[PDB]
């Protein structure tokens, strides 16, 4: 099998020589790479480098340039001056073959890399800031930054990589070819992709290499022995990196790679055994929701097409999970054939295509196809299925005619929430359908690796009158409760909507003006609910428009089309909807059109276009709040969406998938996803988490209490003590009255450590309603208690709670700015102590 993500790996042993300075780490890095087959050469210039490339490409392609021809190949294809990192990257991954016309007029195909036979490519290393650069056919595709042992790797990542887009001179030109960065202090080694567009991911996207059980490989020697094994490295560079329709480069994380290669080997081995068309031919990957199932599964599909014996590879997704970006991606492969309709024509067309393998479609369309068409030639062909998270509504019938009509097949599935006998619900189980579990990356592991955010979950109890309904467990009483007499009661909706309007900005980190921040979804129970909330938001927002011309409204959109508490599949056919809803939808689409200057109508085509454009605008924050029923709750990917407002009954897999809309990692600003619920989901939340996990999993997944973060607590998984906000406040007032107290070195560093804690803690506490109330109390009184009474009604606080809140002592507003200016004055001096990490992202706001 030759897997590059190891099942077992025996930890290496230190040479006893000094491992402290960058010189040490570099010495042994070069030594190790050299032992693993990387030739150390000396390149002191862009010219020496170019000459080396000439040798390697000539060697590789079996050809010889003259100086003229070579100058031309350099100026046009290889080192073209107009090209940036993006262009170089497209040349590495998409078009690596230059069709070159020699001076004698013949055509040769000049390869940058041999992707069929990987080990033919020449790998070698040069050195420098301490850096070791890994050259593939002379081209610098990898770079290793080395810092000393006591250096905080995050600050070192802050340093370059966000400090900013450092120019590219004429002599460093070839280094625009860099695909992959690896940074290490020897204790910890993290790798990550080179950013093309001028965006530049945060530290949260960096990752340690790992084994198939997802246990980390942290230290440079072991990282080297594994990731930098030439076979491993080249595979990461060539096969397990992705360059997509957004022109963004992504390196796959270890778990994604392991799952993928295990799928591929499963296909190969089952084929040579003639073991096709059985559950033992395929498998399922259990990758926790939001860990990249879609990236990975489609990458596996594209890779499974590279098997000589496979005629067709189906990549099928649930039309429910389609969004603007993912549709854009699939357009390049199966044009106009991936959407929310039932039509099979596009599928039939892609199916008959000379020189093609990949067939991207929806489980709906696949189902309809296999229903209606029994004579297809693809049926007797050698076929692979990759099912990305379409396990339910149309899946049963789909599987039925699958096993019926497909004679030679290997079928696989990805899910974050598997089907177990417990939650079976009429559907065959995941294990039953796909057979063995080939790999897993489970939520606790994902949280541990910080590749998925945790949740903060609270039932908002402001509503004594409606609380009986909001806590109701019986299934039949909830169905009956949809009406203006109970759940859709005007006062309930008014009060809730008022809450969302009041606390939107606080939740989304939009509070501080001159800060970008996040946005939200509201997920509701029914079409009428959506209709009511959209109605009520518009009214309440036009009311406060009169109260003030300093009132800045939120942009609100909605989308719904004709539907336990599981999530119902909505059709994309808006002809099914009753006249009331279609009237309301049309109106909102008209408002939407006039606002965004779009032309969308409500016929299925116009609605589909509405769906696409909506997704893009919610993703980029042109929409502040998306009110929804069953849409964009399962596969929608929006790293800037941090808060989900919930008036709905969500259970089990539906629960997780809905909440997981906020689970995407972004930077130190977005600490966890915010879930705010106007029905009580506590027991359902815990049920759901425990379903995929154990009794303890909920302690990892759910964020801690307000009191804990104020007074401190002890993290169970780490074992570490996380000091509370008031102990930080206390220690700031005590140890650093300031600015006089700044002075000596140690008293500076200690202040940076402490104020780091401060900024993190306060940022975390923004999301707590208690803390919002506490901070809002800091303006208020002296004279007219019109605001004092206004403060009580808005934050739902009585005279009892109000009494002690006076006593809680926070630092003066001026003192926070003294602290902040001091923090900057230190960090800047530092740019002109290895232990420390400044919070730049938290600072910037
Ligand atoms: N290796 C990677 N490097 C950088 N970013 C990644 C990587 N893998 C995934 N992501 C990002 O994480 C986000 C979520 O990925 P994706 O939607 O593919 O996950 P998912 O498991 O399908 O989520 P869901 O369970 O909600 O459908 C995407 O924006 C994706 O770009
Ligand atoms: Mg997905």
835 sits in which H/E element: none
d(CA 479, CA 527): 14
Identify the three-state secondary structure at position 558.
strand
Helices 324-331 and 604-619 cross at an angle (nearest 10°) of 110
d(CA 63, CA 97): 14
Distance in Å, CA 293 to ligand 2 centroid: 6
CA proximity to 520, closest of 698, 393, 359, 643: 643
Ligand 1 atom with the shortest distance to the CA of 291: 21
d(CA 812, CA 782): 17
Query: 263 and 301 in one domain?
Result: yes
| Tokens standing for residue 284 | 């399922």
CA proximity to 703, closest of 456, 444, 392, 381: 456
Instruction: Report which protein residue has its CA nearest ligand 1's atom 23.
Output: 290
**Half-sphere exposure in the Cβ direction for 473 (13 Å, CA):** 3
What angle (nearest 5°) sits at the alpha carbon of residue 31, between those of residues 27 and 35?
170
Instruction: Report which protein residue has its CA nearest ligand 1's atom 27.
Output: 635
- Mutational pocket test of ligand 1: of 196, 294, 567, the residue with most ligand atoms within 8 Å of the beta carbon: 294
Instruction: Report which protein residue has its CA nearest ligand 1's atom 12.
Output: 292
Query: 832 and 797 in one domain?
Result: no
What angle (nearest 5°) sits at the alpha carbon of residue 346, between those of residues 345 and 348?
60
Domains: count for the chain: 6
Ligand 1 atom with the shortest distance to the CA of 192: 3
Number of C-beta neighbours around residue 474 at 10 A: 9
Output Rg (C-alpha) for the chain, integer angstroms. 29
Ligand 1 atom with the shortest distance to the CA of 634: 26
Strands (E), 343-392: 358-362, 382-388
Question: Which residues face 125 on adjacent strands?
Answer: 40, 134
- In the DSSP assignment, the letter for residue 716 is T
d(CA 634, CA 629): 12
Q: What is the dihedral of CA 640, 643, 649, 654, to 10 degrees?
A: 30
Burial 700-725 (b: 16+ CB within 10 A, else e): bbbbeebeebbebeeeeeeeeebbbb
Distance in Å, CA 452 to ligand 1 centroid: 9
Query: 425 and 298 in one domain?
Result: yes
- Phi (first) and psi of residue 149, to 5 degrees: -70, -35
* CATH number of the structural domain spanning residue 102: 3.90.640.50
Cis ω before 565 (30° cut-off from 0): yes
Task: Report yes or no: 315 and 301 within 8 Å, Cβ to Cβ.
Answer: yes
Ligand 1 atom with the shortest distance to the CA of 451: 12
Task: Report yes or no: 363 and 291 within 8 Å, Cβ to Cβ.
Answer: no
Distance in Å, CA 292 to ligand 2 centroid: 7
Burial 787-802 (b: 16+ CB within 10 A, else e): eeeebbeebebeeeeb
Identify the three-state secondary structure at position 245.
coil
Distance in Å, CA 295 to ligand 1 centroid: 6
Query: 270 and 201 in one domain?
Result: no
Among 84, 117, 150, the domain boundary falls at 117
Among 82, 117, 152, the domain boundary falls at 117
Range of the domain at 53: 45-117
Resolution (angstroms) equals 2.8
> Which protein residues are within 6 Å of ligand 1, measured from CB?
205, 250-253, 256, 289-295, 321, 389, 416, 635, 637, 639, 660, 664
559 sits in which H/E element: strand 556-559
Ligand 1 atom with the shortest distance to the CA of 289: 25
- Mutational pocket test of ligand 1: of 205, 251, 290, 292, the residue with most ligand atoms within 8 Å of the beta carbon: 292
Distance in Å, CA 328 to ligand 2 centroid: 14
Query: 71 and 97 in one domain?
Result: yes
Query: 640 and 577 in one domain?
Result: yes
d(CA 791, CA 784): 12
DSSP string, 52-108: HHHHHHHHHHT----HHHHHHHIIIIIS-TT--HHHHHHHHHT--EEEEE-TT--EE
Identify the three-state secondary structure at position 536.
helix
Query: 666 and 591 in one domain?
Result: yes
Distance in Å, CA 639 to ligand 1 centroid: 9
Q: Which residues surround ligand 2, an ion (CB under 5 A)?
A: 294, 635
Task: Report yes or no: 818 and 738 within 8 Å, Cβ to Cβ.
Answer: yes
Experimental approach taken: X-ray
| Tokens standing for residue 181 | 């960065």
Kindly give the pairing relationship between strand 382-388 and strand 358-362: unpaired
Phi-psi region of 26 (alpha: psi -120 to 50; beta: other; left: phi over 0): alpha
Query: 184 and 311 in one domain?
Result: no
* CATH number of the structural domain spanning residue 152: 3.90.1570.50
d(CA 233, CA 218): 16
What angle (nearest 5°) sits at the alpha carbon of residue 352, between those of residues 346 and 357?
95
Query: 130 and 8 in one domain?
Result: yes
For the chain, the helix, strand and coil percentages under 3-state DSSP, each to the nearest 5: 45, 15, 40
Helices in 692-844 by DSSP H: which ranges?
697-701, 706-711, 725-735, 745-765, 769-776, 786-795, 799-805, 813-831, 840-843
119 sits in which H/E element: none
Query: 385 and 321 in one domain?
Result: yes
Handedness of CA 205, 206, 210, 216 (dihedral sign): negative
* CATH number of the structural domain spanning residue 618: 3.40.50.300
Ligand 1 atom with the shortest distance to the CA of 287: 21
Secondary structure string (H, E, C) spanning 323-346: CHHHHHHHHCCCCCCCCCCCCCHH
Residue set of the binding site for ATP:
287-294
587: Cβ–Cβ under 8 A, 6 or more apart, which residues?
none
d(CA 93, CA 243): 7
Query: 745 and 624 in one domain?
Result: no
Query: 386 and 410 in one domain?
Result: yes
Distance in Å, CA 290 to ligand 2 centroid: 7
Among 686, 704, 722, the domain boundary falls at 704
Kindly give the pairing relationship between strand 382-388 and strand 312-317: parallel
DSSP string, 170-222: SSSGGGGG--EEEEE-SS-EEEEEPP-SS----GGG-B-EE-TT--EE-SHHH
């Amino acid at each position: 099998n030759n897997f590059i993500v190891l099942d077992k790996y025996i930890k290496a042993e230190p040479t006893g020589d000094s491992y402290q300075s960058e010189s040490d780490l570099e010495r042994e890095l070069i030594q190790d790479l050299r032992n693993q087959g990387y030739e150390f050469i000396s390149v002191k210039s862009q010219s020496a480098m170019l000459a080396n490339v000439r040798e390697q490409l000539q060697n590789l392609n079996g050809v010889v340039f003259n100086d003229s021809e070579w100058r031309r190949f350099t100026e046009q294809y290889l080192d073209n001056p107009s090209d940036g990192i993006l262009d170089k990257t497209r040349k590495i991954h998409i078009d690596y073959i230059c069709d070159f016309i020699f001076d004698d007029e013949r055509l040769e195909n000049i390869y940058l890399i041999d992707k069929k036979n990987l080990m033919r490519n020449k790998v070698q290393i040069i050195q420098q800031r301490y850096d070791v650069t890994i050259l593939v056919n002379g081209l610098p595709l990898v770079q290793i930054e080395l810092k000393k042992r006591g250096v905080a790797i995050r600050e070192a990542f802050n340093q370059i990589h966000r400090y900013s887009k450092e120019s590219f001179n004429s002599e460093n030109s070839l280094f625009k070819y860099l695909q992959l960065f690896v940074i290490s202090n020897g204790t910890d080694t993290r790798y990550f992709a080179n950013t093309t567009k001028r965006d530049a991911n945060s530290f949260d996207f960096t990752m340690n290499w790992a084994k198939s059980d997802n246990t980390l490989i942290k230290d440079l020697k072991d990282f080297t022995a594994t990731c930098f094994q030439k076979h491993t490295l080249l595979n990461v560079l060539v096969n397990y990196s992705v360059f997509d329709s957004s022109q963004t480069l992504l390196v796959m994380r270890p778990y994604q790679i392991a799952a993928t290669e295990r799928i591929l080997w499963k296909i190969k081995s089952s084929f040579t055994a003639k073991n096709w068309s059985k559950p033992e031919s395929g498998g399922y990957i259990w990758h926790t929701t939001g860990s990249g199932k879609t990236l990975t599964s489609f990458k596996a599909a594209r890779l499974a097409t590279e098997l000589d014996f496979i005629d067709k590879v189906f990549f099928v997704v649930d039309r429910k999970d389609l969004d603007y970006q993912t549709m854009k991606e699939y357009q390049r492969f199966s044009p106009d054939s991936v959407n929310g309709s039932e039509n099979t024509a596009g599928l039939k067309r892609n199916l008959d295509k000379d020189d093609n393998k990949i067939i991207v479609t929806t489980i709906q369309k696949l189902n309809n196809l296999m229903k209606a068409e029994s004579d297809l030639p693809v049926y007797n062909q050698q076929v692979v299925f990759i099912f990305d998270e379409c396990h339910r509504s149309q899946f049963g019938e789909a599987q039925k005619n699958l096993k019926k009509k497909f004679k030679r097949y290997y079928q696989f599935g990805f899910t974050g929430t598997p089907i177990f006998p417990e939650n079976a619900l009429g559907s065959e189980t995941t294990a039953s359908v796909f057979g063995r579990e080939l790999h897993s990356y489970v939520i606790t592991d994902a949280i541990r690796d910080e590749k998925v955010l945790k949740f903060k979950v609270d039932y908002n109890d402001v509503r004594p009158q409606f609380k009986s309904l909001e806590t109701e467990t019986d299934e039949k009483k909830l169905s009956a409760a949809e009406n203006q007499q109970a759940f859709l009661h005007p006062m309930r909706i008014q009060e809730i909507t008022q809450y969302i309007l009041n606390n939107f900005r606080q939740k989304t980190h939009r509070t501080f003006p001159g800060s970008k921040g996040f946005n939200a979804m509201l997920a509701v129970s029914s079409v009428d609910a959506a209709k009511a909330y959209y109605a009520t938001f518009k009214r309440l927002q036009e009311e406060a428009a009169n109260k003030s011309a300093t009132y800045k409204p939120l942009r609100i959109a909605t989308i719904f089309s004709f539907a336990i508490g599981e999530i119902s599949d909505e059709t994309f056919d808006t002809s099914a909807m009753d006249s009331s809803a279609k009237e309301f939808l049309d109106a909102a689409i008209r408002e939407y059109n006039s606002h965004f200057k779009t032309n969308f109508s409500t016929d299925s085509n116009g609605f589909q276009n509405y769906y696409r454009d909506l997704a893009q605008r919610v993703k980029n924050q042109d929409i502040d709040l998306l009110i929804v029923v069953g849409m964009f709750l399962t596969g929608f990917d929006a790293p800037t969406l941090n808060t989900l407002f919930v008036d709905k009954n969500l259970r089990y897999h539906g629960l997780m998938q809905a909440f997981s809309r906020t689970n995407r990692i972004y930077d130190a600003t977005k600490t966890f996803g915010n879930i705010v619920t106007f029905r009580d989901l506590e027991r359902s939340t815990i049920d759901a988490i425990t379903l995929f996990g154990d009794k303890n999993t909920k302690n990892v997944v759910l964020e801690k209490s307000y009191t804990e973060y104020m007074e401190g607590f002890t993290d169970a998984a780490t074992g570490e003590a996380k000091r509370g906000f008031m102990t930080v406040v206390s220690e700031l007032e005590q140890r650093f009255p300031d600015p006089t107290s700044i002075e000596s070195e140690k008293e500076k560093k200690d202040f940076v450590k402490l104020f780091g804690e401060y900024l993190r803690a306060e940022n975390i506490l923004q999301n707590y309603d208690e803390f919002a109330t506490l901070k809002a109390l800091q303006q208020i009184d002296l004279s007219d208690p019109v605001a004092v009474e206004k403060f009580k009604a808005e934050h739902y606080v009585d005279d009892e709670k109000f009494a002690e809140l006076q006593t809680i002592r926070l630092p003066a507003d001026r003192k926070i700015q003294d602290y902040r200016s001091a923090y900057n004055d230190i960090r800047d001096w530092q740019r002109r102590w290895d232990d420390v990490v400044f919070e730049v992202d938290l600072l910037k706001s």
